[PDB]
């Protein structure tokens, strides 16, 4: 993505998509393992489908004609040049379109992770805008691990976050 | 306390071309085009026929100065010098020569 | 020079590792070879956008 999350991370080396928590116990660059392995499986399937679908038989594309058979030579040249033109155009267009699709795929993965986190933190956190969420309660390492895991219990912190939200 | 969503960045400077943009910096890229060779005539299932200084016309006719390489059994293709100096020692025309070269290209 | 190496395709300058679908080494090949194209590079992106701070 390059929209509401305008900066990539260099200190997160585990996975493609992940988290970053600031806490009274310390900061860190965690990774979201499920999304990055799903993306890796998808990209592996994409590359293998692009490469392995090309099954070719044994052929020799070179022919020799004498000086009284130039219609044959030009027909063979037309066949070869037409095949080269078709393959070149198709390969270039395919690569361009698939690069666009792959970048959109990564965009969708990042956005889906963002909405997945946002759904759990209904109003116990506030969006800041860069891609970040500031809690109204004290999210310790257990709470942060729950948020990254997907089992964040809203009712446990609901009133503690509500009083902070209404304070300001 | 905050938790932020982000994504991976590294120190690579690989560039790729999409359909809506050009020269995009990417974290990784795979080459679908093979642009290199090992410079050697490998084996295509079997070993190719190696004529050296001779041509197909001189080999099949039994050139006197080509008697060394007349022991090879079945092969996969023929390798010939770009301008074989030893072909038909006696000048003449080889009828259907380009057809014979196609017949004998793999036995 | 002729070597005892093994290959699937063969270009009049040297064999090709036919693991990729396309090639631009030479038009006239022999054996099951990738498809010749007139492109200088075909990079397919697998990672994401590189935007370091």
């Amino acid at each position, epitope marked *: 993505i390059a929209g509401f999350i305008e900066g990539g991370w260099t*200190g997160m*080396v585990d996975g493609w998509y992940g988290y970053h928590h600031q806490n009274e116990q310390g900061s*860190g660059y965690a990774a979201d*393992q*499920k999304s990055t*392995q799903n993306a890796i499986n998808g990209i592996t399937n994409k590359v293998n489908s692009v490469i392995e679908k090309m099954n070719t038989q044994f052929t020799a594309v070179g022919k020799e004609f004498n000086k009284l058979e130039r219609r044959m030579e030009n027909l063979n040249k037309k066949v070869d040049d037409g095949f080269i033109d078709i393959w070149t155009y198709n390969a270039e267009l395919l690569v361009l379109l698939e690069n666009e699709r792959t970048l959109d795929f990564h965009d969708s993965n990042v956005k889906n992770l963002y909405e997945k986190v946002k759904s759990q933190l209904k109003n116990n956190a506030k969006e800041i805008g860069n891609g970040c969420f500031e809690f109204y309660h004290k999210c310790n390492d257990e709470c942060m691990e729950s948020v990254k895991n997907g089992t964040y219990d809203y009712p446990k912190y609901s009133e503690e976050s509500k009083l902070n939200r209404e304070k300001i | 306390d905050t938790i932020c969503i982000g994504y991976h960045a590294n120190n*690579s400077t690989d560039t790729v071309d999409t359909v809506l943009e050009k020269n995009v910096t990417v974290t*990784h890229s795979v080459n679908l085009l093979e642009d290199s060779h090992n410079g050697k005539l490998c084996r295509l299932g079997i070993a190719p026929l190696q004529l050296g200084n001779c041509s197909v016309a001189g080999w099949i006719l039994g050139n006197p100065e080509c008697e060394l390489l007349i022991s090879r059994e079945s092969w996969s293709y023929i390798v010939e010098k770009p301008n074989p100096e030893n072909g038909t020692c006696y000048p003449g025309h080889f009828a259907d020569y380009e057809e014979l070269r196609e017949q004998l290209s793999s036995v | 020079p002729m070597d005892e190496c093994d290959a699937k395709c063969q270009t009049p300058q040297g064999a090709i590792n036919s693991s990729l679908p396309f090639q631009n080494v030479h038009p006239v090949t022999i054996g099951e070879c990738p498809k010749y194209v007139r492109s200088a590079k075909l990079r397919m992106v697998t*990672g994401l956008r590189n935007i370091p701070s």
Partner: antibody, heavy 125, light 105 residues
Framework: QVQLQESGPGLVKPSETLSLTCAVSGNSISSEYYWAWIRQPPGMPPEWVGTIYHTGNTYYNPSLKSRTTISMDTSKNQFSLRLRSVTAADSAVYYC??????????????????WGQGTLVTVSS | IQMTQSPSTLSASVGDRVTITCRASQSISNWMAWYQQKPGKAPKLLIYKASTLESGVPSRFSGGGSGPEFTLTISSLQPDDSATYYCQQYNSYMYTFGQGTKVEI
């Protein structure tokens, strides 16, 4: 092309610290991969103890996190384990391994691909 | 996270097609790893990502499955296969090993 060699005391008295050191050759341990300690009690399955990243990030086993500490030497290729409060249950074979596999330019810590040799630590007096 | 590997012990003649099954408590990964430890030596990874073969590993070893269940299959058994086989999974920041499966001729 990566060679790991462990070194430490084979006999450790109870209730005293326990120091081991793994030295690496053919690779730089402050640059690329992750480096872990794995122990195996006699007649039991292997147990992961901890891991240190090439960025200096350490992740420990939750059961042994309180008594363990993994350090790195950014001068020569060495990483050390300091397991404190050692009882008789710590008598086991200890291994240093390299975790990390690179696919699509991304290094994942999933598995240990190269292992050390294994030093047996016996806790007896 | 709990990892269960079956059968615990196994005896099979040379040439038998053997299969070991590993089950994981949580299916957040489609991936599992297989190690072969011979007595007195360190483990040696054979399969990773639940299907990929490590370099230098004989082709008869293979891996399959997904979700909650994965399988390691040896087609043409050899006399040097007597060892303990372990299934391992890295889930979030924890590596969990499964109990071994001894193999005897």
């Amino acid at each position: 092309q990566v060679q790991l060699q462990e070194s430490g005391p084979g006999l450790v008295k109870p209730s005293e610290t326990l120091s081991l050191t793994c030295a690496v050759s053919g690779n730089s341990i402050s640059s690329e991969y992750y480096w872990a300690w794995i122990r195996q009690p006699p007649g039991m399955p292997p147990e992961w103890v901890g891991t240190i990243y090439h960025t200096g990030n350490t992740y420990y086993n939750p059961s042994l996190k309180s008594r363990t500490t993994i350090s790195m030497d950014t001068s020569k290729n060495q990483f050390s384990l300091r397991l404190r409060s050692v009882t008789a249950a710590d008598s086991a074979v200890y291994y240093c391994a390299r975790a990390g596999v690179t696919i699509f330019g991304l290094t994942l810590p999933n598995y240990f691909h190269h292992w050390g040799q294994g030093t047996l630590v016996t806790v007896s007096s | 996270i709990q990892m269960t590997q079956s059968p615990s012990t196994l005896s099979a003649s040379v040439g038998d097609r053997v299969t070991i099954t590993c089950r994981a408590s949580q299916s957040i990964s489609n991936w599992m790893a297989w190690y072969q430890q011979k007595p007195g030596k360190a483990p040696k990874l054979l399969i990773y990502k639940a299907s990929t073969l490590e370099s230098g590993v004989p082709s008869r070893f293979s891996g399959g499955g997904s979700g909650p269940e994965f399988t390691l299959t040896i087609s043409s058994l050899q006399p040097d296969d007597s060892a303990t086989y372990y299934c391992q999974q890295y889930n979030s920041y924890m590596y969990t090993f499964g109990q071994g499966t001894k193999v005897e001729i």
